[PDB]
């Protein structure tokens, strides 16, 4: 529910003001998933990373 208006002058140039309670109730909640890969390969000699 967006309201087009100026409030507190914190929306001067293309900025917007969010509601603390709305953000607390789950609005805009995002999840960032990253991957960390590791490899344990065998070399020419009969030895392996452990």
């Amino acid at each position: 529910t967006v309201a087009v208006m100026s409030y507190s002058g914190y929306d001067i140039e293309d900025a917007l003001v969010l509601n603390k309670a709305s953000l607390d109730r789950g609005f805009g909640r995002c999840l960032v998933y990253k991957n960390a890969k590791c490899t344990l390969k065998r070399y020419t000699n009969q030895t392996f990373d452990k």
């Binding site: 529910t1 509601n19 309670a21 709305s22 109730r25 789950g26 609005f27």
Partner: protein, 65 residues
């Protein structure tokens, strides 16, 4: 993913009415009269319940189980 418990704008408990809205949909009630009977006067809760997509079952279909 799942219906939120609280509404973003106001904060009325709406997660408990998701199954009731689904039942009203399975019934002959339309979206408008269903949301009216559910007790949602202000349009914020109506939007919360209407614009919500049910993906929890789509994810459980892929869950390990």
């Amino acid at each position: 993913m799942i219906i939120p418990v609280r509404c973003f704008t106001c904060g009325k408990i709406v997660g408990n009415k998701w199954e009731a809205y689904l039942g009203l949909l399975q019934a002959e009630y339309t979206e408008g009269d269903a949301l009216d009977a559910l007790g949602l006067k202000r349009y914020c809760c109506r939007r919360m319940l209407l614009a919500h997509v049910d993906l929890i079952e789509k994810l459980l279909n892929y869950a390990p189980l």
